[PDB]
Structure 1
Amino acid sequence: PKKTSFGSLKDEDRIFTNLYGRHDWRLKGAQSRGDWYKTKEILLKGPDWILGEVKTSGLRGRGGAGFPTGLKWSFMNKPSDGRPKYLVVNADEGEPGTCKDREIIRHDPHKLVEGCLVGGRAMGARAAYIYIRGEFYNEASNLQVAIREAYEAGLIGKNACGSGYDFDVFVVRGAGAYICGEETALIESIEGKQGKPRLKPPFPADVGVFGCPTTVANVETVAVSPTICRRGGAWFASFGRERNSGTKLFNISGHVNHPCTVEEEMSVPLKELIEKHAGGVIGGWDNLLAVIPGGSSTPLIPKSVCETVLMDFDALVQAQTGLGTAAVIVMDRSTDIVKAIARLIEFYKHESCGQCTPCREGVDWMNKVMARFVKGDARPAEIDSLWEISKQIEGHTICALGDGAAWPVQGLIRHFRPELEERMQQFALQHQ
């Protein structure tokens, strides 16, 4: 009837079966692994049926925010006012701890291409723009080899798959900016400007890239869709809990015996992931200090919280953190957590686009303050100031980079204030 322990996903129900590149990644291998199967029928069922199945699966955003996919994709169901419509696949993957998108674009690129076709048909888009980060040169070239095979086989382009739908897939490499993972900053980076995010009340579904209706989607969100439509949608919904449904790619990095990328059933306990797939934290589970669950934006949790937490959006939101990109960065007890969070804040300072005052000035301010916190060169009355500054950045910026910089600070202050004050007191004792 119902599930209560959402783990131990089998190989049969894993979407990304060429995750480690141990099979052919080209068209011939991908076809034998189920790809590009009855795509003509999926397209001919119509956009309404495809979107209905994407809603039935309960799939949410796999690139952070986790907004439901079927509802987001249905903003394009409107009739055309003359302007073109595009699907913009987000392949930037700039979040520290996250390397899951990199693995699809080079070992299952045809999954991404056919997901582009299925989704763009669902949104009624003429072309797909895959914006990959410029650092993924080999992955981008693998993706474009796959796109070339899809074109030469008639699966993309004129009369795509025999459906009569005309669809193009263009790859546009980035040039070294993490802010270009943000959907509107990505849009403006496609348009040849600085990667600065736009103010939202004009939404990408109305005014997107080139000023046309667009939907920006993560690589995994796009790539799972052909298996969602071809396997049932109900089949996808039978994995994980309610709301947060399906399966996810997990990046386990940090103080782990076997850091790895694995596909595990959603709502999996963090313990099962770390022990079964990652081989456990070095020194055992007793040696665990924090774990950052969903990439650098998601605030850390302590070992007590991480002891009995489940890996989905709702369970991790209950734990004052987020699921983010399902990039778990575990830290053993031999870790300077203040140094780690200061390094993350330094990353966010280096990646701020500088457009808006709170991110531009405040993230730099928080980096300056956190650098002192590593040395202890501060008074304990500055911790509350750091909290207030982070809340002043949070909810006051154009994009979510300010929020994702303020959140690691809050997660450090929330669970490791004694360590910060201990460092400050040691510094006061050393420097009289």
Structure 2
Amino acid sequence: KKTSFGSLKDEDRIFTNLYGRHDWRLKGAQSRGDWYKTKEILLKGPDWILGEVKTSGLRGRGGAGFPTGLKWSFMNKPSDGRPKYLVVNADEGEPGTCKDREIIRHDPHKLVEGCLVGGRAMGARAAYIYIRGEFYNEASNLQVAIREAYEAGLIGKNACGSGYDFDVFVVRGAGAYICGEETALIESIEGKQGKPRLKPPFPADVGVFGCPTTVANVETVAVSPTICRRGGAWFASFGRERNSGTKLFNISGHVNNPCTVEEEMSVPLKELIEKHAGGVTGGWDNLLAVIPGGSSTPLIPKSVCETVLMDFDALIQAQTGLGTAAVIVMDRSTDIVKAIARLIEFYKHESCGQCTPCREGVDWMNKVMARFVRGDARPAEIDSLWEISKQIEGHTICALGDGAAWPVQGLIRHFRPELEERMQQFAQQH
């Protein structure tokens, strides 16, 4: 098999206009292989399409990483009289993550074709693309592409000549990171506060407008056309088993050249930072910690970053997660407690307030963390903060509560000496 991963070639990259160096409109997209034999794919049938996705090993790129083929097949059932919808999650809210922005504004026609191919697999009549309101220019690029597809017969009535009717609607958010959560996104489309729903029912049974729905990430949907064209087996030839394919990575923070890049799954974290981002500022030995998969994932110290691979299973073993694969790098000049405290301040501002452990708990954690930044606390409070975070985790309606507990747990797990040392400094001034 393949024992080492990385060094992906440009022939096997999916998002070939990641940097907008080529034309993003239909003329460019068609020249790059989009919208090619889309009729053939549609007439092959939903079950064949779901087979290519199941075999590809594709997992959700939104942050939870559920196997996409299995998830999308929940809609593969007879209609009971309700319409069926595909919702594309373009809310891109997780701090550090900006991968979905590049697909929307530079490769919009892969998204539009992904909606059709993915929508057909589920038997949906339309796709709603929820894009955060701040991406005003990107959403306007996406509407231009949709108009081109409508005018070329690629979507709408009898899309691509397949005899299948499909509409692509774009709906903008109004400022809320919580509206990226799948059920909070659905409540937002329906015109309510972006407050998540409890489960059951699951969206595949009762979703947007009370109808069967599948919420899929922009990247998950956008790669689906190519997986069908080139085959699921070709996609599964990348990355470790159960960690298949090509992933978009955002390297930001204390790196020489922060950038977005497409690289093979299971690539070593060290290789990804040095090969593409130009290394850690001040050299690798200046590394202090990395948040691998966006602010919701716990940080890992330099010792773990030395050998860790970038996939779902590798990072779970390192007591974290792949998340959105947004790598925030912190060199030894960083005030680590402050950096994580600013992340809890973010979740405090983004909690919807619906359910008690997050409404009260996250705000509680923010107040404690602010005091930890100054050391104005006692060492006994570190274990209190750990216990408090454990009361939020797994007791909330949605995973935002979990995503606020994890960064706190990661800091306490790997940087407890820093916390206690700071407290000693504060006390000796007082």
Measured against the shorter chain, the TM-score band is over 0.9
SS of 1:322's partner is coil
Shift of residue 406 of structure 1?
Answer: 0.1
CA distance in 1, matches of 2:412, 2:122: 43
CA distance in 1, matches of 2:368, 2:3: 44
Shift of residue 45 of structure 1?
Answer: 0.3
CA distance in 1, matches of 2:366, 2:93: 19
SS of 1:111's partner is helix
The residue that corresponds to 1:234 in the other structure is: 233
Shift of residue 201 of structure 1?
Answer: 1.2
Over aligned residue pairs, what C-alpha RMSD do you find? 0.3
CA distance in 2, matches of 1:69, 1:101: 17
- Alpha-carbon displacement from aligned partner over 1:223-261 (angstroms, at most 9, x marks no partner): 000000000110000000011110100000000000000
Shift of residue 152 of structure 1?
Answer: 0.2
CA distance in 2, matches of 1:143, 1:420: 46
Aligned length: 430
1:390-401 equivalences in 2 (<5 Å): 390-401=389-400
Q: Structure 1 unaligned segments of length 5 or more: list them.
A: none
- Alpha-carbon displacement from aligned partner over 1:262-312 (angstroms, at most 9, x marks no partner): 000000000110000000010111000001000000000000001100000
CA distance in 2, matches of 1:96, 1:203: 27
CA distance in 2, matches of 1:244, 1:65: 13
- Alpha-carbon displacement from aligned partner over 1:186-205 (angstroms, at most 9, x marks no partner): 00000000000000110000
SS of 1:289's partner is strand
CA distance in 2, matches of 1:247, 1:22: 20
TM-score normalised to the size of structure 2?
Answer: 1.00
Shift of residue 207 of structure 1?
Answer: 0.1
Q: Structure 2 unaligned segments of length 5 or more: list them.
A: none
Percentage of matched positions with identical amino acids: 99
CA distance in 1, matches of 2:108, 2:336: 37
CA distance in 1, matches of 2:422, 2:3: 43
SS of 1:339's partner is helix
- Alpha-carbon displacement from aligned partner over 1:18-45 (angstroms, at most 9, x marks no partner): 0000000000000000000000000000
1:290-369 equivalences in 2 (<5 Å): 290-369=289-368
CA distance in 2, matches of 1:277, 1:416: 28
CA distance in 1, matches of 2:199, 2:367: 30
Shift of residue 61 of structure 1?
Answer: 0.3
CA distance in 2, matches of 1:201, 1:208: 11
Shift of residue 119 of structure 1?
Answer: 0.3
TM-score normalised to the size of structure 1?
Answer: 0.99
CA distance in 1, matches of 2:277, 2:266: 17
- Alpha-carbon displacement from aligned partner over 1:173-194 (angstroms, at most 9, x marks no partner): 0000000000000000000000
SS of 1:206's partner is coil
The residue that corresponds to 1:51 in the other structure is: 50
SS of 2:300's partner is coil
Shift of residue 14 of structure 1?
Answer: 0.2
SS of 1:66's partner is coil
CA distance in 1, matches of 2:24, 2:361: 45
Shift of residue 396 of structure 1?
Answer: 0.1
- Alpha-carbon displacement from aligned partner over 1:33-75 (angstroms, at most 9, x marks no partner): 0000000000000000000000000000001000000000000
CA distance in 2, matches of 1:193, 1:390: 29
The residue that corresponds to 2:23 in the other structure is: 24
Shift of residue 210 of structure 1?
Answer: 0.0
Shift of residue 387 of structure 1?
Answer: 0.3
- Alpha-carbon displacement from aligned partner over 1:78-104 (angstroms, at most 9, x marks no partner): 100000000000000000000000000
Structure 1 runs of 4+ aligned residues shifted over 6 Å read none
Shift of residue 157 of structure 1?
Answer: 0.2
- Alpha-carbon displacement from aligned partner over 1:319-373 (angstroms, at most 9, x marks no partner): 0000000000000000000000000000000000000000100000000000000
The residue that corresponds to 1:402 in the other structure is: 401
CA distance in 2, matches of 1:238, 1:65: 22
Shift of residue 122 of structure 1?
Answer: 0.2
The residue that corresponds to 1:149 in the other structure is: 148
CA distance in 1, matches of 2:77, 2:339: 46
CA distance in 1, matches of 2:167, 2:241: 35
CA distance in 2, matches of 1:316, 1:388: 23
CA distance in 1, matches of 2:283, 2:226: 37
